[PDB]
Design a protein around this ligand. Sequence first.
Ligand code: HEM
Length: 154
Amino acid sequence: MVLSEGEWQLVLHVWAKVEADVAGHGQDIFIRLFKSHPETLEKFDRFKHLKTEAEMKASEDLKKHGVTVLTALGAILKKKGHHEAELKPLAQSHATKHKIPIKYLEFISEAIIHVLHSRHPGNFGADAQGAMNKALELFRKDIAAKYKELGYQG
Ligand code: HEM
């Protein structure tokens, strides 16, 4: 797939707002993901003991990880599809160290869309959401192709 520049502009315009508060957005995304798909929490030895939303919100460790995650994803979206270099290390650790199925990337994609719709309705109408969904779908398709080359595809 290929996004048009107008699609990238929609993406990067809302990302600009997320970047005003990366830690807050990191936190809402992971809490949405862990609440909606509790099974994903199991992949994180580091966070598995967190039992409630209160504990998640109070964890500085989870807040620190949500900033790492959004920083990495932000660097990929800013490349506007030319993200082959950034993807390599991330595909390698996620297929071989952490063993994250593509279906869990779909779950966090759904969490990111849910939080942007909630916090930024003004910059996240239907066309901007269709653009972010194509950006994340591109990300997922390119990561799945690397997974296959690395010997994991799943
Ligand atoms: C937008 C998608 C994602 C991005 C950009 C992202 C990025 C990152 C980054 C940059 C790191 C640290 C370096 C590394 O190990 O590669 C990391 C670690 C990790 N990722 Fe992801 N990730 C994403 C999705 C997920 C999902 C959905 C899961 C599990 C459901 C996951 C599980 C983990 C784990 C288990 C670690 C190691 C945590 C620790 O013990 O320090 N990742 N991720």
